[PDB]
Amino acid sequence: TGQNQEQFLLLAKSAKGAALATLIHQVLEAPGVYVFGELLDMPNVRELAESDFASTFRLLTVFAYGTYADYLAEARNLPPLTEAQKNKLRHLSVVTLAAKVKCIPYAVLLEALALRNVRQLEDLVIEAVYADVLRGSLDQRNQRLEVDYSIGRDIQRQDLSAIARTLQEWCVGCEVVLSGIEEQVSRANQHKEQQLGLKQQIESEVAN
Amino acid sequence: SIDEIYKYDKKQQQEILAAKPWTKDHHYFKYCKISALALLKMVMHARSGGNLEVMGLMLGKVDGETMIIMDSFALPVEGTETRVNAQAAAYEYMAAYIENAKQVGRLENAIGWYHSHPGYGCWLSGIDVSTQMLNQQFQEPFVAVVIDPTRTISAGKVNLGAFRTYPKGYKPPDEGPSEYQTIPLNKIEDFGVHCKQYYALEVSYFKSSLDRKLLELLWNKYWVNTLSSSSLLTNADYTTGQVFDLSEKLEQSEAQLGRGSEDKLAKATRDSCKTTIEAIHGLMSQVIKDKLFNQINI
Amino acid sequence: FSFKKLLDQCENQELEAPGGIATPPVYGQLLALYLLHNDMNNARYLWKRIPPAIKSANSELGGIWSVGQRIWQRDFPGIYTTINAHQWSETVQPIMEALRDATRRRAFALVSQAYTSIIADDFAAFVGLPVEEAVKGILEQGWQADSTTRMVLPRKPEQQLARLTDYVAFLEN
Amino acid sequence: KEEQFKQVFKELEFLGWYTTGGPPDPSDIHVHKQVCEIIESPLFLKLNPMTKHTDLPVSVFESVIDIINGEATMLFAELTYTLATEEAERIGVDHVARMTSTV
Ligand SMILES: [Zn+2]
């Protein structure tokens, strides 16, 4: 998303209670809008929390942080969604699965998205790749989804540290590899010169 | 001044061509300066030929004992390495190319010829020596550049040589270190026959101030390509071809020990060493990639 | 883990303490420990090294070798029967239970590799435990049990850069 | 020139044109239309040799033909680009950039 961010933020700053409550149902039922981080952090939408339209804010929280199974567990409280919105939330659940692991079996996908047959799932993954949400390829025989690239959904202000926790884990990793080379290169010289020196001793005994 | 070398002085070139100091000394030309553009174009052309020899012409100039290559261009010729003066078939094309180049501000004229030796090292064969001797007899000042694109890739270092022939009957002086290269058995006989009929120039490279700037800025993104090289499988067939040769070399070195050329086993050992060292370097890059991108986890 | 240390200590006591002939409880420990590691070539040559005097005076040693005969013949039910026959607390008894456990792990690992389908009674005799206990354990583990025919169908189950640098340093010099 | 490059680069084709300078201007559009007389959808590459900035001063564009207030006019749309992954070229470029044991 990018154009829709500005286009709906313009309307978000110029909207009130009920108009915002219906705007939430309009942003979730719109193609391309898979991130709601700027929209959920608005004071105008913060007013809707713990108010007359609380379930809509909870629905936006599920769409920005939770999965389709989390929606199914709280479907009695949350407002009803159409097939397009249910699909979108399923796409985002596949993104969460893809964020966890690279190779996703069909069983875990069928259980997490609440699907009955394989083609439904395959068609949803196609709809994902076609909406530029996921990249990858499907394997029928081994019944597995090979994920090449998945987008970012969750913002997580409190759990942000975890990102750094992995980034540092990569940094340290680099810092090992780098030093490794520095040492190995040094060794590669340490041998060479030594050997040359040794040869120069052998060659000095030819005169005797 | 980094860009001073790019200035073309036509009268100065005419003065040097009228003076002909190379006639006073057969070792007159000692250095070969190649532009980054010409190097890249010749290596790119050489790689584009694959396992087949290609050739082209080099545009440039002379400056004291130094031959300067500014640009190069491919010739649409058959029989590189089999035909003496194969370039001759492109005479017409060379005349038109240069004419058209002059129309767009390429002022430098023919300074030499380049051709590739895919997977068999930089040196001059019998055919190459006849070709270069012709060129030095009728087109002087002229230089012969040879590139091995396959070994460039496998060694991770540019494999290029610049050579000039000796006139018929003339003997080289005492000093000849000769930097060693593995020559395959199907080429080694001809190599040995003609290796003393020419000498190697000291090669160096140059780039402009803008090239310098642009290559630093290119590197700011081109680093990604160095950590995704995959060199072990790009030209695998080369190392397997070399091993075949190495095996037949070892067969000959075994025949030498059988009953009873100067120590074939030591040569074969240095060949097997070089091939293996290249292979291990490939694995080094692969393991480095595995250490950086795979061993991270959640 | 700690049995290997006691083996090395007994192997030192084998030569340091004598006078020619070593201590009988150390001989018993050394024999049972030689059975524990399945090194029957060491155990057979240890038993033949024992003088007939200790062989007559200490019959418990012969009771330890009676297990080794069955291990040499590879008769598993006989191994489990001979283990639970003699008692020699603190010295030989605490390692005989370790031998029993090791023989159970060895037999289980053998049946898991060598057999596709095996009779449940044969398998029970191979592990020493009764038929019901064995079938319960393998069904909990994940082996395909079949009643009526009484068949059990088993299921078969720098660090790198420095070495490379040493190899290139060898070849290049 | 095409008759000449087709003899040695038989598998290659005319893809577009380049020039030097800042952001695209009316002159670039005029020339681009002339190149459009030769090939259908040519690329336009612009290199800024007098850059003040820290990023590689190369940009690539496609042409789009739009209608603004009833006038059918040509405009440029910028395309993102990646650098080539040729091993021999990487080694050559690296060797050039560096310009100075086996391990
Ligand atoms: Zn040649």
UniProtKB/Swiss-Prot annotation, chain A:
Residues 1-152 form the PCI domain. GO terms for cellular component: COP9 signalosome; cytoplasm; cytosol; nucleoplasm; nucleus. Keywords: Acetylation, Coiled coil, Cytoplasm, Host-virus interaction, Nucleus, Phosphoprotein, Signalosome. Residues 178-208 form a coiled coil. Phosphorylated by CK2 and PKD kinases. One of its GO terms (biological process) is regulation of protein neddylation. It is found in: Cytoplasm; Nucleus. It comes from the Eukaryota. Widely expressed. Expressed at high level in brain, heart and skeletal muscle. Component of the COP9 signalosome complex (CSN), a complex involved in various cellular and developmental processes. The CSN complex is an essential regulator of the ubiquitin (Ubl) conjugation pathway by mediating the deneddylation of the cullin subunits of SCF-type E3 ligase complexes, leading to decrease the Ubl ligase activity of SCF-type complexes such as SCF, CSA or DDB2. The complex is also involved in phosphorylation of p53/TP53, JUN, I-kappa-B-alpha/NFKBIA, ITPK1 and IRF8/ICSBP, possibly via its association with CK2 and PKD kinases. Belongs to the CSN7/EIF3M family. CSN7 subfamily. This is COP9 signalosome complex subunit 7a. It comes from Homo sapiens (Human). The gene is COPS7A. The chain holds residues 8 to 215 of 275 of the full protein.
From Swiss-Prot, chain B:
SMART domains: JAB_MPN. One of its GO terms (molecular function) is macrophage migration inhibitory factor binding. A motif (JAMM motif) lies at residues 115-128. It comes from the Eukaryota. It is found in: Cytoplasm, Cytosol; Nucleus; Cytoplasm, Perinuclear region; Cytoplasmic vesicle, Secretory vesicle, Synaptic vesicle. It is an enzyme of class 3 (hydrolase). Belongs to the peptidase M67A family. CSN5 subfamily. The CSN complex is associated with some 'Lys-63'-specific deubiquitination. Such activity is however not mediated by the core CSN complex but by the BRCC3/BRCC36 component of the BRISC complex. Probable protease subunit of the COP9 signalosome complex (CSN), a complex involved in various cellular and developmental processes. The CSN complex is an essential regulator of the ubiquitin (Ubl) conjugation pathway by mediating the deneddylation of the cullin subunits of the SCF-type E3 ligase complexes, leading to decrease the Ubl ligase activity of SCF-type complexes such as SCF, CSA or DDB2. The complex is also involved in phosphorylation of p53/TP53, c-jun/JUN, IkappaBalpha/NFKBIA, ITPK1 and IRF8, possibly via its association with CK2 and PKD kinases. This is COP9 signalosome complex subunit 5. The lineage of its organism: Eukaryota, Metazoa, Chordata, Craniata, Vertebrata.
Swiss-Prot record, chain C:
Residues 1-157 form the PCI domain. It is found in: Cytoplasm; Nucleus. The keyword Repeat does not apply. It comes from the Eukaryota. Coiled coil: none annotated. Belongs to the CSN8 family. This is COP9 signalosome complex subunit 8. It comes from Homo sapiens (Human).
UniProtKB/Swiss-Prot annotation, chain D:
GO terms for cellular component: COP9 signalosome; cytoplasm; cytosol; nucleoplasm; nucleus; perinuclear region of cytoplasm. It is found in: Nucleus; Cytoplasm; Cytoplasm, Perinuclear region. Belongs to the peptidase M67A family. CSN6 subfamily. It comes from the Eukaryota. GO terms for biological process: protein deneddylation; protein neddylation; regulation of protein neddylation. Its main location: nucleus. The chain holds residues 108 to 217 of 327 of the full protein. The keyword Nucleus applies. This is COP9 signalosome complex subunit 6. Widely expressed. Component of the CSN complex, composed of COPS1/GPS1, COPS2, COPS3, COPS4, COPS5, COPS6, COPS7 (COPS7A or COPS7B), COPS8 and COPS9 isoform 1. In the complex, it probably interacts directly with COPS2, COPS4, COPS5, COPS7 (COPS7A or COPS7B) and COPS9 isoform 1. Interacts with the translation initiation factor EIF3S6. Interacts weakly with RBX1. Directly interacts with COP1 and 14-3-3 protein sigma/SFN. Interacts with ERCC6. The lineage of its organism: Eukaryota, Metazoa, Chordata, Craniata, Vertebrata. Keywords: Cytoplasm, Host-virus interaction, Nucleus, Signalosome.
